Amino acid sequence: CLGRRVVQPGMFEDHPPTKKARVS
Amino acid sequence: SLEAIVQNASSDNQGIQLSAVQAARKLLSSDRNPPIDDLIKSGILPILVHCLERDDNPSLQFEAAWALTNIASGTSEQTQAVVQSNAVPLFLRLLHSPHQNVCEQAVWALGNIIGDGPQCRDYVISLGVVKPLLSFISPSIPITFLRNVTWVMVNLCRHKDPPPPMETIQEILPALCVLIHHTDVNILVDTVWALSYLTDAGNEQIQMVIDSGIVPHLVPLLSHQEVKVQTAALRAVGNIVTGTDEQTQVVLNCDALSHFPALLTHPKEKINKEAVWFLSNITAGNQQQVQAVIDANLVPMIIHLLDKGDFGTQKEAAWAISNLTISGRKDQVAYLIQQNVIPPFCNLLTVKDAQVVQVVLDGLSNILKMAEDEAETIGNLIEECGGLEKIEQLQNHENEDIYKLAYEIIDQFFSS
């Protein structure tokens, strides 16, 4: 169906991590 | 050994403790494959959580918080072990420590826990993390700490089943207003990503973002020097323009479309594709929004990508074209025809993505139904480029909606 669409798979894949370890 | 560390950590003497907990922290922070499972299976977690209570030894609190942070950086099983040891209330306690390193490390650990999922996010929220977390944002805060704070904010905004509570969004948005005027690149990227998770949460969350007044500050970042900021901003405003016409119009009112020539010609195919996705949500709007895209001189660039872009971009450009026919006027569709939309539009009738084929057929159907007198001209254009034969072939397609529409187009417009 024609119309507006939510963000598609494969888009904007460089997202911030959900988790980070503190490494030294 | 781990047995040794656990034995020394469970002492009642805080020096022996400190020694052992620092050893565990080192094991957990010396490389990118830490032995998390082995330290969980040693029993150390309730000991570390108890260490967190020792306001008399800040160094011990800090080492335990670092150790627990890195354990909680792993899989959901490992984060959840941390959560089940009762770490969260103690980390929230340590948000008020007078010692900066303990405070920051507590922020970090809670970031990993909130990031695990929406119910962990909401448990930490319900215990009151947001007000003390936002109380750290000040002119004097060190920039590394502020970056960790705004990363945690990203995690408070993300996940959608359910999305964060309305009250939490209301508390976070003023902080995002403050932080979007920052110049540090990581702070900007994280701020804009937090906003983009909010604008993907629902039309009411979009409305909250709009009502905060932050959109005019968000739109000009589409031309930021840093491509990570650019793409984050494209996601944030793109999510907005998935909403209603009024919500889309808030974005258009900031002159968003003037930023797109540099995105449609960007070397990166993924940015071309994302930009066309945005514009296809614009052309699905009312006549005035279609006209805004036209006036902004973007149609030739869209058609050029429909012809010569990578296939992903071409699919998005097909959506842009077809969506324009939802509410577009006859004259606007005629402008598309003059710009040579037909041949590259029709070239997509043969691909294996049945969705794209349906989209293009829907667009061709609306175009023909709209061009009262010119329907013969447009039909001859479709025939010229081989589109008519492709419709005839689609009469044999597997998909009922497709071959139905192909029969119908041929009967209604190519059977005289």
Numbering used by the authors:
A (entry chain B): 419 to 442
B (entry chain A): 72 to 487
The authors write:
To test whether the same binding patterns were present in the NiV W protein, we examined the binding determinants of importin α:NiV W complexes using the same approach. We observed binding patterns that were very similar to those seen with HeV W for both importin α1 and α3. In comparison, the importin α3:NiV W complex had P1211 symmetry, diffracted to 2.3 Å resolution, and showed more extensive binding, with residues 421–446 bound to importin α3. The importin α3:NiV W interface was mediated through 31 hydrogen bonds, seven salt bridge interactions, and buried 1591.8 Å2 of surface area. However, there were marked differences residing outside this region, with importin α3 ARM repeats 6–9 binding HeV W and NiV W residues 419–444 and 421–446, respectively. Notably, despite binding the same region of HeV W and NiV W, importin α3 exhibited a 2.4-fold more extensive interaction buried surface area than importin α1, with 16 additional hydrogen bonds, and six additional salt bridge interactions, consistent with its > 50-fold higher affinity. We found that mutations within the viral W proteins predicted to disrupt interactions at the minor site of importin α3 (specifically, R422A/R423A and R422D/R423D in the HeV W C-terminal domain and R424A/R425A and R424D/R425D in NiV W C-terminal domain) were no longer pulled down with importin α3 in our co-immunoprecipitation assay. Similarly, mutations predicted to disrupt interaction at the importin α3 major site, K437A/K438A and K437D/K438D in HeV W C-terminal domain, and K439A/K440A and K439D/K440D in the NiV W C-terminal domain, also failed to interact with importin α3. To further test the involvement of ARMs 7 and 8 in mediating specificity, we designed an importin α3 mutant based on the structural data to disrupt interactions in ARMs 7/8 (N348 A/N352A/E387A/N394A), and found a marked reduction in binding to both HeV and NiV W proteins. We found that the isoform specificity was localised to the C-terminal ARM repeats 7 and 8, and that the positioning of these domains was an important determinant for mediating specificity.
